[PDB]
Design a protein around this motif. Structure first.
Motif, PDB file in Angstrom:
ATOM      1  N   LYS A  16       0.822  -1.208   0.000  1.00 45.54           N
ATOM      2  CA  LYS A  16       0.000   0.000   0.000  1.00 45.54           C
ATOM      3  C   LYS A  16       0.851   1.251   0.000  1.00 45.54           C
ATOM      4  O   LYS A  16       0.541   2.198  -0.718  1.00 45.54           O
ATOM      5  N   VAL A  17       1.902   1.261   0.808  1.00 48.62           N
ATOM      6  CA  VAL A  17       2.782   2.441   0.902  1.00 48.62           C
ATOM      7  C   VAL A  17       3.560   2.617  -0.413  1.00 48.62           C
ATOM      8  O   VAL A  17       3.754   3.744  -0.892  1.00 48.62           O
ATOM      9  N   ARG A  18       3.965   1.493  -0.996  1.00 43.76           N
ATOM     10  CA  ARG A  18       4.569   1.478  -2.331  1.00 43.76           C
ATOM     11  C   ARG A  18       3.660   2.103  -3.402  1.00 43.76           C
ATOM     12  O   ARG A  18       4.131   2.911  -4.220  1.00 43.76           O
ATOM     13  N   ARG A  19       2.381   1.720  -3.418  1.00 38.63           N
ATOM     14  CA  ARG A  19       1.402   2.349  -4.341  1.00 38.63           C
ATOM     15  C   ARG A  19       1.306   3.850  -4.109  1.00 38.63           C
ATOM     16  O   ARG A  19       1.274   4.626  -5.054  1.00 38.63           O
ATOM     17  N   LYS A  20       1.253   4.252  -2.852  1.00 41.36           N
ATOM     18  CA  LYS A  20       1.152   5.667  -2.500  1.00 41.36           C
ATOM     19  C   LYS A  20       2.369   6.454  -2.981  1.00 41.36           C
ATOM     20  O   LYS A  20       2.218   7.496  -3.597  1.00 41.36           O
ATOM     21  N   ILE A  21       3.565   5.936  -2.718  1.00 40.09           N
ATOM     22  CA  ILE A  21       4.807   6.580  -3.169  1.00 40.09           C
ATOM     23  C   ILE A  21       4.779   6.699  -4.697  1.00 40.09           C
ATOM     24  O   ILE A  21       5.083   7.732  -5.265  1.00 40.09           O
ATOM     25  N   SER A  22       4.361   5.625  -5.344  1.00 44.75           N
ATOM     26  CA  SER A  22       4.305   5.559  -6.794  1.00 44.75           C
ATOM     27  C   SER A  22       3.332   6.595  -7.357  1.00 44.75           C
ATOM     28  O   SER A  22       3.652   7.297  -8.330  1.00 44.75           O
ATOM     29  N   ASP A  23       2.161   6.706  -6.731  1.00 40.84           N
ATOM     30  CA  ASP A  23       1.156   7.734  -7.079  1.00 40.84           C
ATOM     31  C   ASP A  23       1.720   9.131  -6.955  1.00 40.84           C
ATOM     32  O   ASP A  23       1.543   9.971  -7.833  1.00 40.84           O
ATOM     33  N   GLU A  24       2.387   9.398  -5.851  1.00 40.06           N
ATOM     34  CA  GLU A  24       2.937  10.729  -5.635  1.00 40.06           C
ATOM     35  C   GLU A  24       4.017  11.078  -6.679  1.00 40.06           C
ATOM     36  O   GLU A  24       4.097  12.236  -7.140  1.00 40.06           O
ATOM     37  N   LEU A  25       4.832  10.078  -7.034  1.00 37.98           N
ATOM     38  CA  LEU A  25       5.891  10.263  -8.034  1.00 37.98           C
ATOM     39  C   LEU A  25       5.265  10.534  -9.391  1.00 37.98           C
ATOM     40  O   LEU A  25       5.737  11.422 -10.117  1.00 37.98           O
ATOM     41  N   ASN A  26       4.234   9.754  -9.741  1.00 34.37           N
ATOM     42  CA  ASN A  26       3.436  10.034 -10.958  1.00 34.37           C
ATOM     43  C   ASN A  26       2.769  11.427 -10.969  1.00 34.37           C
ATOM     44  O   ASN A  26       2.719  12.061 -12.014  1.00 34.37           O
ATOM     45  N   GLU A  27       2.306  11.914  -9.816  1.00 32.65           N
ATOM     46  CA  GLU A  27       1.797  13.298  -9.694  1.00 32.65           C
ATOM     47  C   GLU A  27       2.896  14.281 -10.032  1.00 32.65           C
ATOM     48  O   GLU A  27       2.703  15.162 -10.867  1.00 32.65           O
ATOM     49  N   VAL A  28       4.076  14.114  -9.430  1.00 39.35           N
ATOM     50  CA  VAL A  28       5.200  14.983  -9.777  1.00 39.35           C
ATOM     51  C   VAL A  28       5.500  14.905 -11.284  1.00 39.35           C
ATOM     52  O   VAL A  28       5.623  15.937 -11.943  1.00 39.35           O
ATOM     53  N   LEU A  29       5.568  13.690 -11.830  1.00 40.31           N
ATOM     54  CA  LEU A  29       5.952  13.497 -13.212  1.00 40.31           C
ATOM     55  C   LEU A  29       4.851  13.850 -14.230  1.00 40.31           C
ATOM     56  O   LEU A  29       5.099  13.813 -15.424  1.00 40.31           O
ATOM     57  N   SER A  30       3.655  14.184 -13.770  1.00 40.25           N
ATOM     58  CA  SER A  30       2.644  14.793 -14.637  1.00 40.25           C
ATOM     59  C   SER A  30       2.897  16.300 -14.868  1.00 40.25           C
ATOM     60  O   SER A  30       2.455  16.853 -15.879  1.00 40.25           O
ATOM     61  N   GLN A  31       3.575  16.953 -13.934  1.00 38.67           N
ATOM     62  CA  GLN A  31       3.893  18.384 -14.042  1.00 38.67           C
ATOM     63  C   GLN A  31       5.337  18.711 -14.370  1.00 38.67           C
ATOM     64  O   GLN A  31       5.644  19.841 -14.767  1.00 38.67           O
ATOM     65  N   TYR A  32       6.228  17.738 -14.182  1.00 36.75           N
ATOM     66  CA  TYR A  32       7.638  17.908 -14.464  1.00 36.75           C
ATOM     67  C   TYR A  32       8.134  16.842 -15.430  1.00 36.75           C
ATOM     68  O   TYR A  32       7.616  15.725 -15.458  1.00 36.75           O
ATOM     69  N   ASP A  33       9.151  17.185 -16.211  1.00 37.69           N
ATOM     70  CA  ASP A  33       9.708  16.253 -17.188  1.00 37.69           C
ATOM     71  C   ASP A  33      10.497  15.127 -16.536  1.00 37.69           C
ATOM     72  O   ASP A  33      10.634  14.073 -17.107  1.00 37.69           O
ATOM     73  N   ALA A  34      11.086  15.395 -15.372  1.00 40.10           N
ATOM     74  CA  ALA A  34      11.896  14.408 -14.695  1.00 40.10           C
ATOM     75  C   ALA A  34      12.110  14.896 -13.284  1.00 40.10           C
ATOM     76  O   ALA A  34      11.918  16.083 -12.999  1.00 40.10           O
ATOM     77  N   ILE A  35      12.528  13.949 -12.437  1.00 43.11           N
ATOM     78  CA  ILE A  35      13.040  14.185 -11.096  1.00 43.11           C
ATOM     79  C   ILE A  35      14.556  14.022 -11.094  1.00 43.11           C
ATOM     80  O   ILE A  35      15.087  13.098 -11.702  1.00 43.11           O
ATOM     81  N   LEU A  36      15.244  14.926 -10.409  1.00 41.61           N
ATOM     82  CA  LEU A  36      16.720  14.934 -10.343  1.00 41.61           C
ATOM     83  C   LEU A  36      17.169  14.752  -8.901  1.00 41.61           C
ATOM     84  O   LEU A  36      16.612  15.358  -7.983  1.00 41.61           O
ATOM     85  N   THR A  37      18.172  13.895  -8.719  1.00 34.71           N
ATOM     86  CA  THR A  37      18.785  13.636  -7.433  1.00 34.71           C
ATOM     87  C   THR A  37      20.231  13.280  -7.662  1.00 34.71           C
ATOM     88  O   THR A  37      20.600  12.943  -8.788  1.00 34.71           O
ATOM     89  N   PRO A  38      21.052  13.301  -6.600  1.00 30.65           N
ATOM     90  CA  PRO A  38      22.342  12.627  -6.703  1.00 30.65           C
ATOM     91  C   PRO A  38      22.073  11.139  -6.769  1.00 30.65           C
ATOM     92  O   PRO A  38      21.100  10.650  -6.188  1.00 30.65           O
ATOM     93  N   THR A  39      22.884  10.410  -7.506  1.00 28.47           N
ATOM     94  CA  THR A  39      22.710   8.959  -7.576  1.00 28.47           C
ATOM     95  C   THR A  39      23.023   8.336  -6.210  1.00 28.47           C
ATOM     96  O   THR A  39      22.309   7.437  -5.767  1.00 28.47           O
ATOM     97  N   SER A  40      24.094   8.834  -5.579  1.00 25.65           N
ATOM     98  CA  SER A  40      24.608   8.336  -4.307  1.00 25.65           C
ATOM     99  C   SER A  40      24.832   9.491  -3.344  1.00 25.65           C
ATOM    100  O   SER A  40      25.244  10.589  -3.746  1.00 25.65           O
ATOM    101  N   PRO A  41      24.598   9.257  -2.039  1.00 25.94           N
ATOM    102  CA  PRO A  41      24.932  10.326  -1.086  1.00 25.94           C
ATOM    103  C   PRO A  41      26.419  10.513  -0.843  1.00 25.94           C
ATOM    104  O   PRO A  41      26.829  11.507  -0.226  1.00 25.94           O
ATOM    105  N   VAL A  42      27.219   9.545  -1.284  1.00 21.87           N
ATOM    106  CA  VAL A  42      28.669   9.562  -1.059  1.00 21.87           C
ATOM    107  C   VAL A  42      29.409   9.140  -2.317  1.00 21.87           C
ATOM    108  O   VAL A  42      28.814   8.557  -3.221  1.00 21.87           O
TER     109      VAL A  42
END
Lengths: 452, 452
Positions: free
Chosen positions: B342-368
Motif C-alpha cells: 500500500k505504501v509502495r502504491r502511494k509513493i508511486s502515485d505521488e511520483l506520478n503526480e510529480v511526473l505529470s507536471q515535471y519532465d523528470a526528477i533529479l537527485t544525486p545517484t549516491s549520497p557519497v
C-alpha cells in the motif's frame, strides 16, 4: 490437617499444617512423584540427589522446581541448550538463595524453550514438555516445565521468568497461578537473560495466596542487581479483602481480535462475577495499545543481540538469506530502537492514565487454550501468543494469571494488571476471583491427575 | 576514425567506425587488457576462450562483460557464490541472446556481491572488485565488476542488474553511465534473481548514447518473461534534442539528509547547468518518499525469502539468535507485506503526480563517493547507500546515472528519473547533461588509466 492425604494437591499453606513426620517426607515424595509422572509430562531437565531434610526456616521441607535458566548450586543449569548440558554454576541466583533461606527445597530444574526464547517449550534442546491436562498439547512457555510440574503436582510450587508473558502464559495454559511482579521488585542476579528492561522472575503456584507468599520471599533489594528497588511492597496482608466498590477497565482492543470462543465466554463470566461482588466493569480505549507487540519485538530482540552428492545449493541460499536477514534486522534496530522506546513510553503513559481511574485492567491471559505439540508452525501466529501479556512487561506493571474454568476441556486464564507497586491489590483482586469462581471447589481450581 | 588509438577509450559508436582489420582485433585486445588490468581491478570472475570473430550483426566484434548472475553459454555462471563455482547453464539469458544476435562478443563474466545481495561488491564469495579510480575503494554494487570493467576500459560496455540501485550506483561510484529501464522493458529470463517486482537488467556504458543503443538491443517482449510488455519504446531517436523549456523537480527530501559536501556541490552545479540550457528547476515535496527505504526492505527481502577445546557457547548463542531473528522477520513480512505494498502504491502515485507536471526528477545517484574496502561495517549506513536509487524500482520508473565531476577525487553521479515509458526523454535529458558538462572533454567524462 496434619496428614498428607495427596501430595499432588498440596499447597504451601497446607504443608505448614502437616505434622513434622509427614512434612519431612515431602522432598522424597516429590522425587517419587517426578519418577512416576515425569516420563509422561517431561517437565524436568534434572532432579536433585535425595538428601536429609533440614528443618530450618518457616517453609522447611517444601519441594519446589526452578526453571533451568536460573542458576543453582548442586545441579546444572542448561538453559535447555545442548551447549550447557553439563554446565554447573556452583552459585545460587538471589531468588534461589532467598527460597532456600526461607526453607524451601529445590528438587529439580524445569524445562524451557532454549535460552527462554519461545512461547510453548517446544524449542527446548532436549524435548517438549507436555500439558498435564492433555499430553498431546503444549504447556505454554517459556516457563512450561515449571507450570506443568506444579499443575501435575510433582512439586508444591515453582519459579519461572517472564519477559513478555513467559510466567503468566504457561500458567494460563496449564491451569495454575502465574505472577509477574512490578519491575524492580525481584533480582535478576543469576537469571541467564537477554532483556534487562522487561524481565522479572515470578512464582507459579496452585493458589493465589501461595504466589503472594513466594513474592514475599523472593522480592527485595539486591546490590548485585541495580534495577532492584528499595521500596518494600506488601503482597499478602490485604489479600482477603475483596473487590466490592472497585472499578475495572477492559481494553476495547480485546474485542478487535478473533479469539477462541470459549476463552471469550470464560472471560465475560469473570467480568460478571466481579460485578456480582460489587465492582464495576467498563470498556476503555487505550490509543496506542495496538502497537505493543510490534514495539516489544523491536526492544526485546534489540536487547538480546546487545547481550560427492551433487548437493548444497539450497543450504547456501538459505544461509545467505539468513545471514542477510540478520544484518538487515541490525539495521532496523539501529533505525528504530529509539522510536520503539518512545512508543513504549506512550503506551506506558496511557496505561498509567487508565490505572489512575481504575483499580486494574482485565484481559484474558491468552487468546487460545493449549494447542497441539507440532501444531503451530506459522510465525505470525506463534508470535501473537503473548498479545495480552506483553503490555505489562512494556510498562513494568504487576500482572497475574488466575484460572477461570475451561474451553475445549483445557484451562483458561484471566489476567489482572495493576499499577506499579500495586502488587498487593493485584493479589487481592485475583483472590476474589479464585475464592468466588463457579469453577473452583472451595476456592481451588481442579488439578489434573496424570496416569502413571 | 578507422584506427583503434586506445582500446580503453572505445565507445560502441567509435567501434562502428573502425576499419574491419582494427575491429576484428577487439575481442582479443579485450582479453589482453583484462590480463594486464584485472590483477589490480579484480572485475572478472571468468573470461572466455579467445576464438574467431564472427562478422555477423551490426555490432560484430564489440567486446562486452556480463554480470555473473546472468546465465551464459560457454562460461560458467557463479552468482559470485562458492556453491556455483563450477555451474554451467548451457543456456543464454534472453538479454545475452539479443546482444549476441546484434553481434556483441561476451568476453567475460563480471564480479558481484554473492547472489546480488549487496551494495559494494565486497560480499563476493571470491574477492572484492576494486575501483579503477582508487584501488583501495569499492566500485559500488551489486554490479561492481561490470562498472569497474567498463571504467577501466577492459571492455566497451557491460550489463548489470538493478533491484534497488545495483546498476546505477556502481556506475555512479566508478564514473560511468548506468541505466535502469522502465519495469517491463527488459526480460529477466536467465537472471538469477530473488525479487520479481523490482528488478531490471540494464546497461553500463562510457557514454549516454551507448546506453541508449544497448537498450534498443536488449529491450522487448519475451514469452519466457510474462512481465515483459508489448509496448515498444524508442530510446535513441530524440537523444540529441536537449532540455530547453523543460521543467525538472528536485525532492526536498535530498536536503534533509547530511550527504557528502562535494556530492551536494556537483549536484547543485548540474541543476545550474540545466537552467543555463533553458530548463526550470523547482523543489517539490513528495509526502511519502521518506518511507521508500523501509518499504523496499519489507518487499525485496519478503520476495527473496519467497523465491576437546572447552568452547562453543558464543557460536550457539549467535546461532540461536540468528535463527530466532529469521523466524521473527518471517512474522514481520506476514504482518506487514500488504501494508508495505500500500505504501509502495502511494509513493508511486505521488511520483506520478510529480511526473505529470515535471519532465523528470533529479537527485544525486549516491549520497557519497566510493568508500574504502573494509570501511563500512555499520549496517544502517550500508543499507542507506541506495537511498536515492530505491524509489525508481518501487515505482517501476526509468532512471539513469550520469557522471558529473568529482568529489574527493572520486566520480559523482547525477540521477535523472522519468515517468514510466519515458525512457527516451530520460536519455535526452542525460545526454544534455553529458554534452554540456564542464567536467567532460568533448562531451565525454574522463576514464581512469589503471597502471599495469
Amino acid at each position: 490437617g496434619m496428614i498428607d492425604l495427596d501430595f499432588r494437591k498440596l499447597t504451601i499453606e497446607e504443608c505448614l499444617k502437616l505434622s513434622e513426620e509427614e512434612r519431612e517426607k515431602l522432598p522424597q515424595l516429590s522425587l517419587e512423584t517426578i519418577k512416576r509422572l515425569d516420563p509422561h509430562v517431561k517437565a524436568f531437565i534434572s532432579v536433585r540427589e535425595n538428601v536429609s531434610v533440614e528443618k530450618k526456616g518457616k517453609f522447611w521441607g517444601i519441594p519446589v522446581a526452578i526453571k533451568d535458566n536460573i542458576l543453582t548450586l548442586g545441579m546444572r543449569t542448561t538453559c535447555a541448550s545442548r551447549i550447557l548440558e553439563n554446565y554447573e554454576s556452583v552459585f545460587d541466583a538471589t531468588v534461589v538463595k532467598k527460597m532456600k533461606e526461607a526453607g524451601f527445597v529445590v528438587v529439580g530444574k524445569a524445562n524451557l524453550d532454549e535460552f527462554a526464547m519461545g512461547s510453548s517449550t517446544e524449542r527446548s534442546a532436549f524435548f517438549p514438555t507436555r500439558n498435564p491436562w492433555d499430553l498431546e498439547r503444549v504447556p505454554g512457555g517459556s516457563s512450561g516445565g515449571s507450570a506443568a510440574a506444579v499443575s501435575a503436582g510433582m512439586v508444591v510450587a515453582a519459579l519461572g521468568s517472564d519477559t513478555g508473558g513467559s510466567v503468566r502464559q504457561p500458567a494460563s495454559l496449564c491451569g495454575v497461578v502465574g505472577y509477574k511482579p512490578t519491575y524492580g521488585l525481584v533480582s535478576r542476579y543469576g537469571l541467564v537473560a537477554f532483556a534487562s528492561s522487561l524481565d522479572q522472575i515470578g512464582p507459579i503456584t496452585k493458589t493465589v495466596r501461595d504466589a503472594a507468599i513466594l513474592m514475599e520471599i523472593i522480592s527485595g533489594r539486591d546490590e548485585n542487581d541495580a534495577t532492584t528497588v528499595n521500596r518494600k511492597v506488601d503482597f499478602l496482608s490485604e489479600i482477603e479483602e475483596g473487590v466490592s466498590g472497585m472499578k475495572f477497565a477492559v481494553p476495547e482492543e480485546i474485542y478487535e481480535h478473533d479469539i477462541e470462543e470459549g476463552v471469550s465466554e470464560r472471560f465475560e463470566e469473570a467480568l460478571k462475577l466481579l460485578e456480582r461482588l460489587g465492582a464495576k466493569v467498563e470498556r476503555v480505549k487505550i490509543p496506542h495499545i495496538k502497537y505493543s507487540v510490534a514495539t516489544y519485538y523491536v526492544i526485546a530482540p534489540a536487547e538480546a543481540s546487545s547481550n560427492t552428492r551433487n548437493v548444497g545449493f539450497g543450504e547456501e541460499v538459505r544461509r545467505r538469506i539468513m545471514i542477510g536477514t540478520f544484518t538487515l534486522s541490525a539495521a532496523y534496530y539501529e533505525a528504530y530502537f529509539n522510536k520503539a522506546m518512545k512508543v513504549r513510553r506512550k503506551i506506558s503513559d496511557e496505561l498509567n492514565e487508565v490505572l489512575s481511574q481504575y483499580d486494574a485492567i482485565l484481559t484474558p491471559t491468552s487468546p487460545v487454550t493449549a494447542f497441539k505439540i507440532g501444531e503451530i508452525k506459522d510465525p505470525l501466529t506463534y508470535y501473537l501468543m503473548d498479545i495480552f501479556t506483553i503490555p505489562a512487561n512494556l510498562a513494568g506493571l504487576p500482572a497475574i494469571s488466575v484460572p477461570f474454568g475451561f474451553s475445549n476441556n483445557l484451562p483458561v486464564g484471566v489476567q489482572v494488571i495493576g499499577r506499579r507497586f500495586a502488587d498487593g491489590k493485584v493479589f487481592r483482586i485475583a483472590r476474589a476471583i479464585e475464592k468466588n469462581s463457579p469453577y473452583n471447589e472451595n476456592g481451588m481450581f481442579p488439578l489434573p491427575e496424570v496416569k502413571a
